[PDB]
């Protein structure tokens, strides 16, 4: 009748701009995992995440991972603008061989790992105004060392703390020192957080240890872009409506195929 | 997901000779191009928890004898036992703890090599008591032999049997280093009385030619 | 001393659940990553699960994902394994183990038997000697019991040399079955009487069987 009960099992690359993350998740692309750096500054109507994607950098968690994912996914871009943070008194550009960028050590491209310089680590107090007419998205993190000895060797202070403020948000994080299961060789962890700065607002960062610093901001847009988890191959054909199962005809008013859809689709109808 | 593959599965070594077990991982288990290798070796004897012998590919655990050595870096790893002693007879396992899901090699049985020894073969018809209960077990006994590789075949009026017999093997003897095997052909009482000749055929290296024990009256 | 003791094993019907526990001693339990490893009868080691110092990160093997949950209770130095929808292939000895990179301390383990079989004692049939050379084989077939284990001795412990008691096999009925054989001088068959002593405590079964020619 006029419930669409079949899909093709493939995802058409037209008319929508489809971006395949073969081996990369959107968050991993956002952070700049070295095997994901081909995605720098990429845009998309629909980002397609595969179940064969893997992280190959510093082990990390994102509190509210789903929300960061969906907001980047709906913005439709990874436009990153590098900004001139001044990190006085610390060593910048820390890397780890659990995240190689070729021969030597590496880190996420969009993050700046700060450690002591000499044997002091000062209280960083940095500001970054937003004088533009758009929303700035800042990604940053905090390092959770395995042991008290590792905490003191990297950041001097026995206990660190990160505080990021706007006038519309406040994020104060203290590291959680402790041993985690070996992941790609590491017992330590990084936690990732994010901060939106509206025009005329100013980003404030204060830290006496464990700060993983931002390098700049991602240009926030307001889009009809989105993201989808699917293993359907991408074919060069035409379809206005896409599901994780593949493309579907959109002439019939309804569809049994999947509640998740992108494009001008018939309505899901519970069979 | 990183897979561990050990090699050989089974190994026989003379007393005082050297043993060599090989382990391969499907992906690298080294930190960078560092010498940090997330690889353990274990020894496990019957009825006991494993014991960590070698940690980080090469570091001998406290109290582990000089004779055990490990090396390798990346995907290929080797364990050595240099002047084999009887207490070394056991199953060995490698183990990657680089990244989850963690996983073990499938195990390598290290046994003491002795000279060839032919099995004594015996056969045992079903007891009277068992036949009253409605079942019929025929047992073939392979006694005190070496090596372990032994082919035991059931024939029922010359029809090679499949899927109605089960066997099990003792541990290597503590002093004569042989094995023993018992195979049990099991039938209904009804199917048992259908046939007359029940035969056990044994093929082993120490036998000139395949040996057969058999009986009648089913 | 440094010690882990597991507990909670048993015979459980398929699809049911049961919770394993491990109590740690003689070290700072709260500062150690902890693992569960298991091993099915006659099979190799199989890694099960792992958890961080605080229980904040865990990992489990794909053979148990969705069904087994690992947690710890640092105020009781207690590792746990919550096992749901058990299946026969989950049968094995389960160890708790401390991480020092390579798992340097292990408990003695607790045994889990997932099966539909009802407790049942063995039948003991004689394997009688008959028609190699001055050496007679005789034995006992201990057939159709559940669950393990059974013990066998000959003449109340008095006959030990030349005795082979074999690993049980699990037949397709869900029941176990083993044999115990001894070789004896074929001259003493009309002379010396041979009894096998079988004991299956799970079913309160104790059986003596005479094996004569
Ligand atoms: C569109 O793709 C999805 C994912 O591949 C399909 O949805 C899944 O459909 C299967 C088929 O019936 C559902 O499987 C069933 O699940 C129950 C437990 O809920 C279990 O008894 C069986 O495993 C049974 O096969 C599955 O629930 C459903 N997945 C989700 C997340 O809802 C769908 O079939 C595809 N296309 C259609 C429906 O045209
Ligand atoms: C990304 O886009 C911004 C803004 O258009 C530009 O300034 C920057 O250089 C770009 N970077 C790369 C690597 O293309
Ligand atoms: C960092 O700078 C802001 C700018 O006004 C100031 O209000 C704040 O108190 C400073 N933080 C510290 C710890 O001095």
Author numbering:
A (entry chain A): 41 to 311
B (entry chain C): 1 to 218
C (entry chain B): 1 to 131, 135 to 216
Q: Paper's wording?
A:
We describe a focused, protective antibody response, abundant in memory and serum repertoires, to a conserved region at the influenza virus hemagglutinin (HA) head interface. Known broadly protective antibodies engage sites on the major virion surface protein, influenza virus hemagglutinin (HA). These include the receptor-binding site (RBS) on the “head” of an HA subunit (1–5), sites on the HA “stem”, and a recently identified site at the interface between two heads of an HA trimer. Stem and head interface antibodies realize their full protective potential through Fc-dependent pathways that lead to the killing of infected cells rather than by blocking viral entry.
S1V2-51 has a short, 9-amino-acid HCDR3 that lies within the heavy-light chain interface and creates a hydrophobic vault into which HA Pro221 and Trp222 insert. HCDR3 caps the vault and supplies polar residues, including Asp99, which forms a salt bridge to the Nε1 of Trp222. HA engagement is similar to those of murine interface antibodies that also coordinate Pro221 and Trp222 within the hydrophobic heavy-light chain interface. The human and mouse antibodies also contact residues of the receptor-binding site. In S1V2-51, a Phe extends from a long CDRL1 to make van der Walls contacts with the conserved sialic acid-coordinating residue Leu226. S8V2-47 uses the same light chain V segment as S1V2-51, IGκV4-1*01. In these examples, HA binding is not biased by gene usage as their light chains engage opposite sides of the head interface epitope. Despite the substitution and rearrangement, S1V2-51 bound the A/Bangkok/01/1979(H3N2) isolate.
